[PDB]
Design a protein around this nucleic acid. Sequence first.
RNA 1: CCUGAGUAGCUCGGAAAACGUUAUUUUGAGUGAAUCUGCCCAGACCAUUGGGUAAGCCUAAAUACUAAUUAGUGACCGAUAGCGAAACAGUACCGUGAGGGAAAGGUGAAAAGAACCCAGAGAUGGGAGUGAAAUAGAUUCUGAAACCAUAUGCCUACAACGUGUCAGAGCACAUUAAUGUGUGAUGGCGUGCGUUUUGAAGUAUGAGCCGGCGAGUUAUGAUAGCAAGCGUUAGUUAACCAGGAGAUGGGGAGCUGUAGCGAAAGCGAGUUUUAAAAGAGCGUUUGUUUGUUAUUAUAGACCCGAAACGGGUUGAGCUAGUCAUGAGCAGGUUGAAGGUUGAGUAACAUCAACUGGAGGACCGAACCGACUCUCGUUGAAACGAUAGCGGAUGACUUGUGAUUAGGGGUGAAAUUCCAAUCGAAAUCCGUGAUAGCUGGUUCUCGUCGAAAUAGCUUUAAGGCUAGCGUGAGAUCACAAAUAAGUGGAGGUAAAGCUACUGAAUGUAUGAUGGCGCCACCUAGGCGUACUGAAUACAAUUAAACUCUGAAUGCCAUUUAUUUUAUUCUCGCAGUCAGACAGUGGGGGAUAAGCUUCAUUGUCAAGAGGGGAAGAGCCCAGAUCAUUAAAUAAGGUCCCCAAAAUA
RNA 2: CAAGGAACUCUGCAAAUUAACCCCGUAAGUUAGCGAGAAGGGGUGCUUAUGUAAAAGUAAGCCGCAGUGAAGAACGAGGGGGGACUGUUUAACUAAAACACAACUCUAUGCCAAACCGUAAGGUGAUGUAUAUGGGGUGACACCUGCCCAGUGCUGGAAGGUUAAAGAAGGAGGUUAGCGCAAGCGAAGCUUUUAACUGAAGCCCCAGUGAACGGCGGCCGUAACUAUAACGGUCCUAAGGUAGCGAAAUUCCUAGUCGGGUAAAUUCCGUCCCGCUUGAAUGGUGUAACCAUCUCUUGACUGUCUCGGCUAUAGACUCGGUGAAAUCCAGGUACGGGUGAAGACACCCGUUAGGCGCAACGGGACGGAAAGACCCCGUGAAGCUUUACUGUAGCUUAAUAUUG
RNA 3: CGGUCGCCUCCUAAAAGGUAACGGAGGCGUACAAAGGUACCUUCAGUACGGUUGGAAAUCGUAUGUAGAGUGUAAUGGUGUAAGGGUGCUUGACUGUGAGACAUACAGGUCGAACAGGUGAGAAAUCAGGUCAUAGUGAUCCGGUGGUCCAGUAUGGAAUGGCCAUCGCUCAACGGAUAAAAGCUACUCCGGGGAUAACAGGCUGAUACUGCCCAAGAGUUCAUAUCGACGGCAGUGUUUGGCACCUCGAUGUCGACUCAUCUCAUCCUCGAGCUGAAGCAGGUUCGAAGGGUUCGGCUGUUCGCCGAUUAAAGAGAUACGUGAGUUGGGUUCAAACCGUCGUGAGACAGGUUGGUCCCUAUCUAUUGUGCCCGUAGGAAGAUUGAAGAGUGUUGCUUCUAGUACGAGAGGACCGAAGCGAGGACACCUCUUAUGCUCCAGUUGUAGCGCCAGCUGCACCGCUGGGUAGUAACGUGUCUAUUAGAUAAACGCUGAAAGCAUCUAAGUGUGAAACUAUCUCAAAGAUUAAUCUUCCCAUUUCGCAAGAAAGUAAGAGCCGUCAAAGACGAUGACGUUGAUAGGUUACAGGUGUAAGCAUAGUGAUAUGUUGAGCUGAGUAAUACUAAUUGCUCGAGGACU
RNA 4: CCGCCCGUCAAACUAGUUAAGUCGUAACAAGG
RNA 5: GGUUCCAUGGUGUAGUGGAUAACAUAUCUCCCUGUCACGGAGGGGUUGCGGGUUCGAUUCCCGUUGGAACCGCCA
RNA 6: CCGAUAAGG
Length: 88
Amino acid sequence: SKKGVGSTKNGRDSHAKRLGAKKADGQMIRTGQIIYRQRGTRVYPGVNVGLGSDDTLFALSDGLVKYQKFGPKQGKTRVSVVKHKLDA
RNA sequence: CCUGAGUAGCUCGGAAAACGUUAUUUUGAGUGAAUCUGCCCAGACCAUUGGGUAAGCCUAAAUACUAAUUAGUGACCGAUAGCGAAACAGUACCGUGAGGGAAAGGUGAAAAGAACCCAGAGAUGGGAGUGAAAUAGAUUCUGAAACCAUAUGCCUACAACGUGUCAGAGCACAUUAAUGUGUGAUGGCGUGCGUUUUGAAGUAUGAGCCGGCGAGUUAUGAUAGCAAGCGUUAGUUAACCAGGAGAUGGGGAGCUGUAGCGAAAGCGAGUUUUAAAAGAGCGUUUGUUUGUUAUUAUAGACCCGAAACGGGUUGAGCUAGUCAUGAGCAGGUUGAAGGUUGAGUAACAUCAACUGGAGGACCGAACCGACUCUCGUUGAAACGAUAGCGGAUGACUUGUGAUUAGGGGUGAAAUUCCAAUCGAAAUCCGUGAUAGCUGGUUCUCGUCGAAAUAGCUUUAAGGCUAGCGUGAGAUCACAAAUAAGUGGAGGUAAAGCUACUGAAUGUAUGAUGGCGCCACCUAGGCGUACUGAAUACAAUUAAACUCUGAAUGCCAUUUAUUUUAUUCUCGCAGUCAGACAGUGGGGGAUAAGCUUCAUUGUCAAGAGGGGAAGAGCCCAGAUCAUUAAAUAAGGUCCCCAAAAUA
RNA sequence: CAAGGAACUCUGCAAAUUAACCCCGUAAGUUAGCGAGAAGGGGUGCUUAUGUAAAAGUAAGCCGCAGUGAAGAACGAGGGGGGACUGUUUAACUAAAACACAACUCUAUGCCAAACCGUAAGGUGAUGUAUAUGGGGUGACACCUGCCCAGUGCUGGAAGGUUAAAGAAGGAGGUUAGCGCAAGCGAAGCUUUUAACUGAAGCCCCAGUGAACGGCGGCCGUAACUAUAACGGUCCUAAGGUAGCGAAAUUCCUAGUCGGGUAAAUUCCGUCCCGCUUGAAUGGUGUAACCAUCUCUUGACUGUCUCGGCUAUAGACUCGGUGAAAUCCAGGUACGGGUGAAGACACCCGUUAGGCGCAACGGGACGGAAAGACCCCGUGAAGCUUUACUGUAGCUUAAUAUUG
RNA sequence: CGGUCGCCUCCUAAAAGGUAACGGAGGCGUACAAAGGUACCUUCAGUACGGUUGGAAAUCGUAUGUAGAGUGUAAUGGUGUAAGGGUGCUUGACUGUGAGACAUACAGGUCGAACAGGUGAGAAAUCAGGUCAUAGUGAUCCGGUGGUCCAGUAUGGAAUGGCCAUCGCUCAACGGAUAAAAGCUACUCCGGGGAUAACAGGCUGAUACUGCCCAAGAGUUCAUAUCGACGGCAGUGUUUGGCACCUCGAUGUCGACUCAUCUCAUCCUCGAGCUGAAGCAGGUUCGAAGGGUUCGGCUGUUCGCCGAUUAAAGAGAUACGUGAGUUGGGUUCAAACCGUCGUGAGACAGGUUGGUCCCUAUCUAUUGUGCCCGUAGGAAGAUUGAAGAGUGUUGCUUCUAGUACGAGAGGACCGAAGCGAGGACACCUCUUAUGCUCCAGUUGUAGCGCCAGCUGCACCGCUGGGUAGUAACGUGUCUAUUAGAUAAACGCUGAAAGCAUCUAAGUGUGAAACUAUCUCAAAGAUUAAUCUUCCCAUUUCGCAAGAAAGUAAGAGCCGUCAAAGACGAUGACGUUGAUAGGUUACAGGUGUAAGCAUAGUGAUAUGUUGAGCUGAGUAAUACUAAUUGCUCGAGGACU
RNA sequence: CCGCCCGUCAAACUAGUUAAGUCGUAACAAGG
RNA sequence: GGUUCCAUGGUGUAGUGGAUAACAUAUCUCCCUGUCACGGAGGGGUUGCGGGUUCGAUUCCCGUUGGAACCGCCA
RNA sequence: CCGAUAAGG
Ligand SMILES: [K+]
Ligand SMILES: [Mg+2]
Ligand SMILES: [Mg+2]
Ligand SMILES: [Mg+2]
Ligand SMILES: [Mg+2]
Ligand SMILES: [Mg+2]
Ligand SMILES: [Mg+2]
Ligand SMILES: [Mg+2]
Ligand SMILES: [Mg+2]
Ligand SMILES: [Mg+2]
Ligand SMILES: [Mg+2]
Ligand SMILES: [Mg+2]
Ligand SMILES: [Mg+2]
Ligand SMILES: [Mg+2]
Ligand SMILES: [Mg+2]
Ligand SMILES: [Mg+2]
Ligand SMILES: [Mg+2]
Ligand SMILES: [Mg+2]
Ligand SMILES: [Mg+2]
Ligand SMILES: [Mg+2]
Ligand SMILES: [Mg+2]
Ligand SMILES: [Mg+2]
Ligand SMILES: [Mg+2]
Ligand SMILES: [Mg+2]
Ligand SMILES: [Mg+2]
Ligand SMILES: [Mg+2]
Ligand SMILES: [Mg+2]
Ligand SMILES: [Mg+2]
Ligand SMILES: [Mg+2]
Ligand SMILES: [Mg+2]
Ligand SMILES: [Mg+2]
Ligand SMILES: [Mg+2]
Ligand SMILES: [Mg+2]
Ligand SMILES: [Mg+2]
Ligand SMILES: [Mg+2]
Ligand SMILES: [Mg+2]
Ligand SMILES: [Mg+2]
Ligand SMILES: [Mg+2]
Ligand SMILES: [Mg+2]
Ligand SMILES: [Mg+2]
Ligand SMILES: [Mg+2]
Ligand SMILES: [Mg+2]
Ligand SMILES: [Mg+2]
Ligand SMILES: [Mg+2]
Ligand SMILES: [Mg+2]
Ligand SMILES: [Mg+2]
Ligand SMILES: [Mg+2]
Ligand SMILES: [Mg+2]
Ligand SMILES: [Mg+2]
Ligand SMILES: [Mg+2]
Ligand SMILES: [Mg+2]
Ligand SMILES: [Mg+2]
Ligand SMILES: [Mg+2]
Ligand SMILES: [Mg+2]
Ligand SMILES: [Mg+2]
Ligand SMILES: [Mg+2]
Ligand SMILES: [Mg+2]
Ligand SMILES: [Mg+2]
Ligand SMILES: [Mg+2]
Ligand SMILES: [Mg+2]
Ligand SMILES: [Mg+2]
Ligand SMILES: [Mg+2]
Ligand SMILES: [Mg+2]
Ligand SMILES: [Mg+2]
Ligand SMILES: [Mg+2]
Ligand SMILES: [Mg+2]
Ligand SMILES: [Mg+2]
Ligand SMILES: [Mg+2]
Ligand SMILES: [Mg+2]
Ligand SMILES: [Mg+2]
Ligand SMILES: [Mg+2]
Ligand SMILES: [Mg+2]
Ligand SMILES: [Mg+2]
Ligand SMILES: [Mg+2]
Ligand SMILES: [Mg+2]
Ligand SMILES: [Mg+2]
Ligand SMILES: [Mg+2]
Ligand SMILES: [Mg+2]
Ligand SMILES: [Mg+2]
Ligand SMILES: [Mg+2]
Ligand SMILES: [Mg+2]
Ligand SMILES: [Mg+2]
Ligand SMILES: [Mg+2]
Ligand SMILES: [Mg+2]
Ligand SMILES: [Mg+2]
Ligand SMILES: [Mg+2]
Ligand SMILES: [Mg+2]
Ligand SMILES: [Mg+2]
Ligand SMILES: [Mg+2]
Ligand SMILES: [Mg+2]
Ligand SMILES: [Mg+2]
Ligand SMILES: [Mg+2]
Ligand SMILES: [Mg+2]
Ligand SMILES: [Mg+2]
Ligand SMILES: [Mg+2]
Ligand SMILES: [Mg+2]
Ligand SMILES: [Mg+2]
Ligand SMILES: [Mg+2]
Ligand SMILES: [Mg+2]
Ligand SMILES: [Mg+2]
Ligand SMILES: [Mg+2]
Ligand SMILES: [Mg+2]
Ligand SMILES: [Mg+2]
Ligand SMILES: [Mg+2]
Ligand SMILES: [Mg+2]
Ligand SMILES: [Mg+2]
Ligand SMILES: [Mg+2]
Ligand SMILES: [Mg+2]
Ligand SMILES: [Mg+2]
Ligand SMILES: [Mg+2]
Ligand SMILES: [Mg+2]
């Protein structure tokens, strides 16, 4: 005897968006490359770093990326692109 | 003046052409013109221009094929091959019929085919004789293996056996002279071969043995590798003609490359987009014809296998129905209707006797049928035997002849019967139907060597792309690996709940209600067996709680070392059923040798040693030989190699 | 086969009793025909005499345990289910409750009839004529067959709305003779397309039709012991199951309650009725006779059984002759525990066992025969069904030609 | 069958990203001309106090409060001078593009610096290519619409296309087979699968069953005589279950019959402790598997209820044992009907009637019986017994004794005797069954030419008896007893632990269980045993567990047989013999034979006549058959 | 006539019988 | 075991696409009659429980009770 | 249209 079985009601899931950090600290970067994909600003933008229509951080100039912790109780993260600054 | 009338057109349904109906061609129904200043055509249609003369007929050559006659050829076959048929083969044989359809060759140069003798009844055998050969003898070229017997030598009747292998006495011989050969008392080790599977000694599968046959081809094209010829206004011919069924010569028709871009007109080392010249896309160069190999497309395309479908023929001699003409039912009972007579009736009705011999009547043989037991189930028999059983003058049984034929016939109807076959006969043809499904696929060695994953799929036993393999080439460092150091992202383990959201324990102060007792009909008051907001103290819980919070892992960079590849391009794949062990979890019940994930390993595709025996556990990675040495996991009383002290 | 006699078994399957002739006797029920060979009993030999054409019979006597001395001859009673009956059926597993049958009813058909075979000719119906033919349903005989025409089917219907082909008043473009400085306009001719309007059947709509496809309910309260509800209220439908029968070939609960049959009764008989889901021509309820039908009780009877035993043949077994079969990887083929692809002749650890036959019986060799019929899979096959899709034979309506 | 099929958010997801399940929770197929863009200004919800309507909570003022407010939405993340609120002006909710990246099999998706044109806000810097961010979406084909610097099949147009923009799909099975599509098959078929179910096995033990731990309580009072809650821990595989590892080139599945075997968690019998055990009869626990554990009614039944007995009518396992052992009642083929479902073909773990069960045994296992060889000289006898097999049940009556006990009622332990049921072994004196070359009676027919008398056939024709043999339904026996070592239990003497204490030393008692006693077989017991008796003990040559001949006990072949027996074998005999047949005599069985005589008319009766006949039985008798025959067979190595 | 009275249903005892049960109002007047 | 429907006054049933709840019987008061039934007038009485969304739930959503209607098969 | 009227006195 099988006795019959009930039915499940929740078996739905969405595609996983590949968010997170893309360029790590110290890595050289050119303008227009993505540094951080997020839903809502988890990492604030600094100098030479822009914002998009999806809160995506992209570079604005050549240089080395660099994360600096700031904000109350050092709970806010900020990214920047320190220009090559070779300066001979 | 004549030049082809139910004609060309047009409408409604079809078709032919590459066209799935449409300018052109044709027609089943209807309608219906004009007459060289005419009619038709040049992809709807009109005008200009141009081309051609429908509604009449005949027409050689080049073209298609070979049953047959003559000559000849073959990198075609040589009795399981070649036509099914080398012989008297469409024969023997099978079937009612259409139809299906075999096997089988060889004496010797010459029959000189064995006179004669012996045994025997004879065939025949042993001699003789012929012959080069008779172990060439009609059983007739050679004569393989499986299979059956005889014998020299060795072993075997206390012995647990995938039948072998490594050692090993004794016994008996002497060779492709080789640390020789035949047997093997005894000791150690030892669960076949292919297939398909995560995994087969397999209580999964296929083969009784031997021998023969039996499965990647051909034609036409495309791409790629290798090689040759010719080359920078290159390269190369197709058909056809001549030549031996030739190499080849003629034949430049054409095909590829030479300039690209754009949908296209078009422009041109530029072009498309755009107002743009800016920007961006594509270009601003490396050829062709063959030979060989690999893959692929169309053909049956590696081989074998369906249930089927469509078209044609042959079957009612069995059986089912109908029709024509015949025959059969031993024997014995019951005694209807009707009629006659008599009584009776006013006359009927009714009753009694006699006659009469009807019944899908009764009993029971031949005959027909098949309800039961037993036997038989490779039978006596592809449906019967013995013993019983039902009908047996009728819707009966039976002989002969005719007739109804297959998306049809017949059917007192069960999917019955239609030649031992019927959810729709038998046979031949399309046909070598198709099969993402089983099974099989044939010589060797060397190098390398996977996957059982993701997405899509009328997809889940299949397919495509990506991932992993292999071959060739490029990239030398800036690429990729192994270690050390540094920087960064994160919110897990843990911990905490005065840092939130829920859950939640006790103590103290206590909103609140329940509960009372009063007064007051409405504003309320004093205690509450008790409920419990909020606050303070002390203690708790959480995948979807976080004021916090690692390690590992990940990304990048620095230094040292290593490899030309884990990176890029091209050719060819296989893989899409996984299994177990440790670790972190989900589902289950902190069950499963369960199921689904992440990660480290093994097996798959991997032997050896330990675990007594074990695919996945531990130690490790088998090129071959050695009766050499040191070790890993594991172990040292005996089986079974190795120990002792305290 | 002694004693018992169904205790056997799913079931008296099988086996057993009776059996021919003659003489007595024969019930309930009934369609008055039957039941019926009912049930139950008796006699059978030989001789003499009497009887007859022959008998049969009659009287006396004799023998045996037994006299149709052997062979061939019906076992019976009672209740129930179904089919009225005789019959027919699945050649080769189902003979029956299935089919058929006489009978009832509905429907179509006026004759070149309806229906049917073919494509048509032709033919069956039928050399028949509504007292005839074809089809659907029910199935003697007796009594009955209730309500619903909402949906579907069939028949008929005035007008009205919608609708194809076809015909057709016109409309819109293409082209250019021509008019115009251009622009643009623009005759006829042809040509592309649209079209008012006319246009049958059918459908929408209106009535009838059930022995046409079919259908034919709930809730609440209520009587002077309790119990129940004659009765009242209300919702919906086209109408809410009438008579009859009812634990049924139908009843799930259920081995329903009670009575009978038995020492004891899931079966049987009668009755009760919340009949989940009975029921009136897919008919309802009874019914004499009949059944190789199903089911239950019973007398006789017996080896079915308590319970097994004996005898005779043919096998089997031995000798002489002829001489197969399926199966088969090679075998020299033990047992216990464990292991293993999870149930071992072969693996590990132990135990036992001289070599080889013959007669037996079947434990195993997941024994042999049949590429599992059950289950699943395949973008498999075939048969059948329908308001699945797309078509089509046939039938019917209109336009057009033959056609005045 | 139910549920789901595309996209988005969180957790599982193990602090990069990614990661599945018919895992746990939710949403979406949009909304906004402002909720967009810009410039400027501005900042919670709640709570406390104070105040008409006005109330717990509308609005006002002040203060407090660090987000519990808002951010259109399902969640997540973000954001309190923000991305939240208000106002003014506007439409960048632009055109042509686009270096570089994220993520990806592809197709698609996401972010974007910067350039040219022309705008909006703003003094300007600057910002604006839709919104705080992530869901709000559908390829290709086909056709339609607008624009157009392209084509226009001889030419000019037109028709028809081309390019750009745009429209029509809950193509939601959402990478979409076609513009268009539902069911039954028990009348079925084909290719495959243990990739996947039904039977059995395997793993698990949720559930089931058995047991234990704590003690609340019940129990004249008293947890623990007997029960045992609320809770917890195990054992078995033993019900219902879970997984899908073996098997779909076949593992026959319920019940019944036959044969049984094993386990103990013991129903009876046997022993003991406690008792709320006076006696009898009980309750519970411990030890114990040797034997036994009935017949019937209904049902296919297992199960179950009922009837009558018994000492008892045990629980399970063995492919829910057993179809190459039987049956086929049930399930489950084709046929038919009822109820119900479906419009239908058909369907129902709903009901009913009927319906094919094959195989000659090769290996191994087992029951019996043989040949060969070994046991070291051969043969004939008699033994011991290592290792084994078989049986083991129990009731009633009398006595003890109406004694023990008990007001009474009732009623023993221990022991003895008699009679039985079941099971087993053997036998045929008795009773029965059978008794196919026996006796008698008797029917029909055909024969012996006829009567009489016999023979063949009719189930051995039928019927009544019946020798030997074979058997039970029959009668004899067994189903005892004893010893040893013990289980549970009880001990005596005794310390560790001056007491106590069955134990540690020592010494006992103790069950149908165990080892023997009882019956059978047994030296292939290769570990091959022991004893007794008998027969071998040559001549030569050379080579000795050597030869040529040459030496006996015994055995076999063959024949007659049955105390035996499928065939072998076993046993008796083979002329010096009673082995078989025949003959003779007798037993037992049958029942007065044929013929004759008498009587009767005849069937028939009487006397001769307890007569005749007789398969196997008992014993004598060589009359016949077992012939006057052939073969095998011995010197025991050495230590 | 605010008289009389019938027939179902319900209860008990043996169709009848029953002091005060329920639904109607059929008959006695022209019983409507 | 699974799936669909329902829960409204004292009893039988409608509505509400969120802002609102009626019908009949029954009940009460008063005419009515000798009285009562019937009749006439007037009066009165409502979303199963929970928990979310909304400013607002009988209505919308998810759970929990009670009553029904369907299914639970192939071996 | 128009129905009813508890028992013994
Ligand atoms: K199987
Ligand atoms: Mg996500
Ligand atoms: Mg064509
Ligand atoms: Mg001309
Ligand atoms: Mg043209
Ligand atoms: Mg002309
Ligand atoms: Mg040939
Ligand atoms: Mg040959
Ligand atoms: Mg012939
Ligand atoms: Mg010769
Ligand atoms: Mg030969
Ligand atoms: Mg030869
Ligand atoms: Mg030996
Ligand atoms: Mg030994
Ligand atoms: Mg061994
Ligand atoms: Mg081995
Ligand atoms: Mg091979
Ligand atoms: Mg397999
Ligand atoms: Mg497998
Ligand atoms: Mg094997
Ligand atoms: Mg198999
Ligand atoms: Mg296979
Ligand atoms: Mg085989
Ligand atoms: Mg040439
Ligand atoms: Mg007759
Ligand atoms: Mg067809
Ligand atoms: Mg059928
Ligand atoms: Mg046939
Ligand atoms: Mg083929
Ligand atoms: Mg196919
Ligand atoms: Mg390698
Ligand atoms: Mg792998
Ligand atoms: Mg993986
Ligand atoms: Mg597939
Ligand atoms: Mg934690
Ligand atoms: Mg907390
Ligand atoms: Mg887990
Ligand atoms: Mg797990
Ligand atoms: Mg697994
Ligand atoms: Mg593999
Ligand atoms: Mg290994
Ligand atoms: Mg090992
Ligand atoms: Mg190596
Ligand atoms: Mg060493
Ligand atoms: Mg050693
Ligand atoms: Mg008897
Ligand atoms: Mg008797
Ligand atoms: Mg019986
Ligand atoms: Mg019985
Ligand atoms: Mg019979
Ligand atoms: Mg009778
Ligand atoms: Mg009846
Ligand atoms: Mg009949
Ligand atoms: Mg009949
Ligand atoms: Mg048949
Ligand atoms: Mg039959
Ligand atoms: Mg005619
Ligand atoms: Mg009928
Ligand atoms: Mg009938
Ligand atoms: Mg009717
Ligand atoms: Mg009508
Ligand atoms: Mg009745
Ligand atoms: Mg029955
Ligand atoms: Mg009855
Ligand atoms: Mg009817
Ligand atoms: Mg009836
Ligand atoms: Mg019959
Ligand atoms: Mg014979
Ligand atoms: Mg195991
Ligand atoms: Mg198969
Ligand atoms: Mg298909
Ligand atoms: Mg992560
Ligand atoms: Mg991680
Ligand atoms: Mg939100
Ligand atoms: Mg905004
Ligand atoms: Mg299309
Ligand atoms: Mg043109
Ligand atoms: Mg899809
Ligand atoms: Mg098959
Ligand atoms: Mg499996
Ligand atoms: Mg357990
Ligand atoms: Mg006590
Ligand atoms: Mg266990
Ligand atoms: Mg059990
Ligand atoms: Mg699995
Ligand atoms: Mg198995
Ligand atoms: Mg097999
Ligand atoms: Mg088999
Ligand atoms: Mg079998
Ligand atoms: Mg015990
Ligand atoms: Mg004993
Ligand atoms: Mg079991
Ligand atoms: Mg069984
Ligand atoms: Mg059993
Ligand atoms: Mg089971
Ligand atoms: Mg068996
Ligand atoms: Mg069986
Ligand atoms: Mg059999
Ligand atoms: Mg078997
Ligand atoms: Mg049966
Ligand atoms: Mg049968
Ligand atoms: Mg059927
Ligand atoms: Mg119906
Ligand atoms: Mg032994
Ligand atoms: Mg005697
Ligand atoms: Mg005579
Ligand atoms: Mg003491
Ligand atoms: Mg003792
Ligand atoms: Mg030896
Ligand atoms: Mg004698
Ligand atoms: Mg005499």
